[PDB]
Write a protein that binds this ligand. Sequence first.
Ligand SMILES: CCC1=C(C)c2cc3c(CC)c(C)c(cc4nc(cc5[nH]c(cc1n2)c(C)c5CCC(=O)O)C(CCC(=O)O)=C4C)n3C
Ligand SMILES: [Ca+2]
Ligand SMILES: [Mg+2]
Ligand code: NA
Ligand code: NA
Ligand code: NA
Lengths: 216, 213
Amino acid sequence: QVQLLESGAELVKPGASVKLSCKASGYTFTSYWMHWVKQRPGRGLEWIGMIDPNSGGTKYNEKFKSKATLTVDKPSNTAYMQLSSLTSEDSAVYYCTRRDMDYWGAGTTVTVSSASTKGPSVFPLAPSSKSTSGGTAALGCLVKDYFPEPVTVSWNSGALTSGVHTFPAVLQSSGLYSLSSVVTVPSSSLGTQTYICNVNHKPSNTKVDKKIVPKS
Amino acid sequence: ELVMTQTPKFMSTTVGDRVSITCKASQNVGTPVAWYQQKPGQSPKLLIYSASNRYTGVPDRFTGSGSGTDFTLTISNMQSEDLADYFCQQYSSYPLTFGGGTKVEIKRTVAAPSVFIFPPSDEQLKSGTASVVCLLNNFYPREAKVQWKVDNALQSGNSQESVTEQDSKDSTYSLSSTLTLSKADYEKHKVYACEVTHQGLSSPVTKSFNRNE
Ligand SMILES: CCC1=C(C)c2cc3c(CC)c(C)c(cc4nc(cc5[nH]c(cc1n2)c(C)c5CCC(=O)O)C(CCC(=O)O)=C4C)n3C
Ligand SMILES: [Ca+2]
Ligand SMILES: [Mg+2]
Ligand code: NA
Ligand code: NA
Ligand code: NA
């Protein structure tokens, strides 16, 4: 089972650099070329260049020859992509992919800004507050004022996936992000069933668990 | 650079109907062309290589065609599992290039949203602000209008909206409207209402509550 592990999201200050890693497992490392792709929202995909984990040979996309630098380390089968003098233009999701591109890393979201990190505040979205409607009930968690993206949400430690809606994040005017994750369940499960949203914000090393009880 | 021009940018199609995506090469490439599928939140998946070679595990529903500078991806039978983005690639010459992509969505019958309202939590109020959230669950088409009303005053500029990508099980969309007010403004007012106008509604439904307590 080929798995390309890529580091967590990175918040980088303008003008600095960052070293993204891509550790290979489940196959002979020095056996395949490794690529790196850059992806921005509502933007095409871009090939940065590739590297030979065996020879050291490297080839670049003429446009990224000055900002990207590719390397590897056989002892750890880990590939590395360093970016320099970063600007908001380098903000994006970077991926590492095998030679033929049949295996992709999950991706590392990179944001370039002078703004500091900030973990999210999580508030409960009380089930059918007071007035208990009929049939199915909705509830959730408001995750807000965190920076930068991304933030992960799960219900009951991944135990709950049915009827879960995690909305795309929106940049508030404060320059801080916010979003809600909701789930619809049978109103008779309330009170008896405990709904807990697990929010994670790796950039701030924040990890929150919040119980959602029927509005009182 | 051997630019790959992909079209259309957007396409909507009924489950059961067919879809075609095309990539025009600025120069001659021959046969080294590929295609990828990417759903929201995941990474690209290899779908086809060699212009018409279908990667293992990929259904015959997908078929790559063409040669030279004209290439095409076809979904002979659009299904729920095909809801995603599509990218073409060219690897006959360096640097490797991708196509601009195609957001492939599903066309279905109109569906009215189920509406819920969420008063701010006690916890948040002592922070100095309030969030009032209105939810439009499982509806179609995407297009929707949500207006807020407090003490009957039509709020403006104080609410933000977010819309989910099309759902694979329902082929529907969902939306949230969040109203942000100060603990002050919020404690001096009482009736908070969310009004939803949508094609599947013969007249706009409204969800509201009182600042109970
Ligand atoms: C992203 C584009 C791309 C796609 C899609 C692709 C597809 C593909 C697949 C997947 C189904 C497989 C099993 C092979 C299959 C192959 N693909 C390659 C070799 C390559 N394949 C390459 C790129 C490439 N190959 C590149 C670039 C090389 C060059 C590697 C080098 O520097 O020598 C080989 C020869 C290398 C070997 O097996 O020793 C086989 C076989 N290729 C042609
Ligand atoms: Ca289907
Ligand atoms: Mg939201
Ligand atoms: Na490799
Ligand atoms: Na946790
Ligand atoms: Na999938």
